[PDB]
Design a protein around this nucleic acid. Structure first.
Length: 49
DNA sequence: ACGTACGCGCTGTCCCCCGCGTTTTAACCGCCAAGGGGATTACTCCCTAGTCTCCAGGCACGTGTCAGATATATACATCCTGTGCA
């Protein structure tokens, strides 16, 4: 979440997003929730609830 | 008025840094998070000098005196002139 290419690619003009990855990690929910943030900006910052 | 010789114009030389293509490295980012000490703000004593004060004294000023420069007697000192001679 704290990288520069995070906010560098967020403000682009698009109507759809598609993420192509092999497999994410099971634990460490901050990066899974971060991929949920980059999917669409509707998720709140609470991942511990 | 003279003069002469160096600034200037011209010509030949050669060489050295610019233009461009190819090689190599400095720095920003991702990871992966932590602390750290030094100016800042606030507070709290504490004691050195401003201010007032009076007592003393010392360097600018006036005068004494020698150092150095100056103008003038002076004892010889070199031409000139009578002057006597062989």
């Amino acid at each position: 979440f704290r990288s520069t290419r995070w906010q560098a690619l967020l403000n682009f003009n698009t109507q759809r997003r598609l993420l192509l990855t092999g497999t994410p990690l099971q634990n460490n929910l901050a990066e899974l929730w971060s991929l949920l943030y980059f999917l669409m900006p509707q998720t709140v910052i609470d991942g511990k609830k």
